[PDB]
A paper describes a structure:
Vesicle amine transport protein-1 (VAT-1) was originally isolated as a synaptic vesicle membrane protein, abundantly found in cholinergic synaptic vesicles, and suggested to be involved in vesicular transport. Although these investigations have suggested a variety of VAT-1 molecular functions in cell regulation, amino acid sequence analysis has indicated that VAT-1 belongs to the NAD(P)-dependent quinone oxidoreductase subfamily. With analysis of the crystal structures of free-form VAT-1 and NADP-bound VAT-1 complex and additional enzymatic studies, we revealed that VAT-1 contains a conserved NADPH binding cleft and binds NADPH to function as an oxidoreductase. VAT-1 comprises ten α-helices (α1–α10), five 310-helices (η1–η5) and sixteen β-strands (β1–β16), and forms two α/β domains, designated as Domain I and II.
We observed clear electron density for the bound NADP molecule. In the NADP-bound form, the nucleotide-binding tunnel is filled by the bound NADP molecule, which adopts an extended conformation and is almost completely buried inside. In the binding tunnel, VAT-1 forms fourteen direct hydrogen bonds with the bound NADP molecule. At one entrance of the tunnel, β9–α5 loop (Ser222), α5-helix (Lys225) and β10–α6 loop (Tyr240, His241) from Domain II form the phosphate-binding site and tightly trap the 2′-phosphate group of ADP moiety by forming six hydrogen bonds with the site, indicating the importance of the 2′-phosphate group of NADPH in VAT-1 binding. The nicotinamide ring forms three hydrogen bonds via the amide group of the nicotinamide with the main chains of β14–η5 loop (Phe326 and Leu328) and the N-terminal end of the Switch segment (Tyr285), whereas the ribose of the NMN moiety has no direct hydrogen bond. NADP binding induces conformational changes in the VAT-1 structure. The major conformational change is found in the Switch segment. On NADP binding, the Switch segment moves from α8-helix of the other protomer, which results in a shift of the protomer (by maximum of ~ 6 Å). We thought that the large empty space on the nicotinamide ring plane in our NADP-bound VAT-1 structure may be the substrate binding site for potential oxidoreductase activity.
Numbering used by the authors:
A (entry chain A): 46 to 388
B (entry chain B): 46 to 293, 300 to 389
The structure:
Amino acid sequence: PLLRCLVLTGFGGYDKVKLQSRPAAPPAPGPGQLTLRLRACGLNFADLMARQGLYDRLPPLPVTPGMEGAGVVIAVGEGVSDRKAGDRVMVLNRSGMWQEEVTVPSVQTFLIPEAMTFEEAAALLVNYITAYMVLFDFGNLQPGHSVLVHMAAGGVGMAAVQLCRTVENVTVFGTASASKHEALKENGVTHPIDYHTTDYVDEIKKISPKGVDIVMDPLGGSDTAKGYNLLKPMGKVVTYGMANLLTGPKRNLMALARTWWNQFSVTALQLLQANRAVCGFHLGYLDGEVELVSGVVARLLALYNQGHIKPHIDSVWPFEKVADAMKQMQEKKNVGKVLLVPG
Amino acid sequence: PLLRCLVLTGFGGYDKVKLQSRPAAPPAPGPGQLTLRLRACGLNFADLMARQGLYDRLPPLPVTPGMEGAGVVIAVGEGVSDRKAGDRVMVLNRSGMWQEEVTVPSVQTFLIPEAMTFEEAAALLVNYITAYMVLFDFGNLQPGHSVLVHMAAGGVGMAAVQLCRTVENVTVFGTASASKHEALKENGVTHPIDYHTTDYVDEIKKISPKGVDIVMDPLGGSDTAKGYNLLKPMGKVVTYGMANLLTGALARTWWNQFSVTALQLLQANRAVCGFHLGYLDGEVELVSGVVARLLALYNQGHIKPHIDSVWPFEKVADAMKQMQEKKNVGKVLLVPGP
Ligand SMILES: NC(=O)c1ccc[n+]([C@@H]2O[C@H](COP(=O)([O-])OP(=O)(O)OC[C@H]3O[C@@H](n4cnc5c(N)ncnc54)[C@H](OP(=O)(O)O)[C@@H]3O)[C@@H](O)[C@H]2O)c1
Ligand SMILES: NC(=O)c1ccc[n+]([C@@H]2O[C@H](COP(=O)([O-])OP(=O)(O)OC[C@H]3O[C@@H](n4cnc5c(N)ncnc54)[C@H](OP(=O)(O)O)[C@@H]3O)[C@@H](O)[C@H]2O)c1
């Protein structure tokens, strides 16, 4: 009865994540802990960044990557009141989620709803927490606002478009490759823009010359400034990624140095004479703020049960094909969440 | 039968604002304009900064200062449908409000509700609009949050404390002189702090070690950084003044400008916001929705402007002293009077 795991031994291309096996030791959870078997795991942009050595919250090598999964608790430690063996939970953690068996703090798990599948549960947490906190806690989304959702056909992107639809009369500018544009219109993008073939600043200002109310900035680098200058009065640009660093399977020092030189900085007089806000969000730095993230997860489960959000699964891959899964995200082929299953 | 006005002749001390009179010509407002007679006018910190030559939005000298008033519409220009002669209105403008008769775009006026006096009306707009848009539009105040309200005994300060009370279970840290501390607690301040005699960062972090959720920064300069480092995760510091430039010794920290990078904000899970109401002219729909929400809160009895003192034009100097020498608690008002 062997257990399967993916391990990142070194930094580089796809081949640096390797499949391994381990003897199924008896489950022994500590105090306030849960050991559970994973049915599905999320592939995140942060996992690609960590594989290239550009995610600083990654523990030392070698390590099993992955920050979210969904499965069934097989053993419960002491002090855990709400969990019993056999409960289905989605887990958010710093690393170690690309493996069949994992042990995590009970307070970092969340009860999966009834009709929610393992795939949907594994797709919910990272993307929808990030989108909810970018648009509402920082963005303060309101009826009548305009939102620029970059990478709108991605995980965070599709989640943010759905959450925008939960707010009355919200105009959504979404950027993604032209092929995905049709999918974008199905998900709620009001104005699809292919930023690979056009200048999205110009397209937006041709539609809305005064700009937009919220700009979601996963691109980072120079793009941050573009977002800042697309803001209407009282607007907010929420920066939460550096996706311009990812160009290929291996880290490339040219994009690293270009973002290192073109960092966005703002001064108090700059913000004051404008009527704009700059916000930063990092879910990795929210661990230990379990009350906050838990309230967000409760809002998200409420929205799911009411049928206002439903994670879109692009593709599911076994561990043996983890490389291809990563390609699906790095070659910009995915529309929605990419998932891994333990073969 | 002449009409009175105050004029700013030069930049400097209190004596640089002089009283003048002019014959009362018949009101002739242009298209989309209103000419109205003012019963009360607001004294704002911006007026002091403009008198000292520190307000960038001030028209060239000489000019009548003042940015808010309340009065009676005496003549209506062409194209104005919602305003009629005799209407009681609050007016917001960039300058020219320290005078008996003034002409302004009709879209910069707001019908005063009854049971609101003219003095409360003249105290409402600048302070409560600024406080509302700092706490809600940028700050996104929610139940359970903690707010640091600097200058909590001033106009914006008291307005912001009242608006904080309109949200359930909001911890308010307020900074003002120790005397006004009692007034602070009467207005809704949970933890009065005298930043003249203690370090408000230390006091806050002794009460709440993780900091606060929203920091209202009228101080500017080095204090902005302090505010930024007082923020809990998802916190917001909304800077909306440079009150440290109106020092009136001088420390080495006084020269510290605030600057922040995208990765710093990202790593700290924080937000820095700037608000300047003067740069919102021409955004009448936004400010008008803010005024409507404020009038709603007033009708429900959740906000009531606190008037510190009312002064005639001839005593304008004393009025400015009341604010510049840190004596005021609430709004300072000017009336034409005798
Ligand atoms: N701060 C946080 O807490 C947090 C949390 C979650 C995610 N994030 C960030 O949110 C962004 C998206 O995350 P995600 O997980 O949902 O993945 P994702 O959106 O699916 O990213 C893949 C898609 O982004 C687009 N893309 C843009 N630039 C790309 C690049 N250099 N390489 C590959 N694809 C690129 C591609 O689609 P198109 O070309 O068609 O547009 C691609 O299909 C990422 O920057 C992530 O780092 C941050
Ligand atoms: N950006 C915008 O659109 C906008 C709009 C309105 C106001 N503002 C800004 O909000 C700030 C407060 O405006 P305000 O009209 O309500 O004035 P205020 O609050 O009445 O300020 C006076 C009070 O501030 C305190 N204070 C702090 N530093 C001071 C100093 N260096 N000199 C004198 N007094 C000082 C004094 O009381 P204590 O010492 O007891 O505290 C004094 O009682 C101002 O900086 C204003 O520029 C901005």
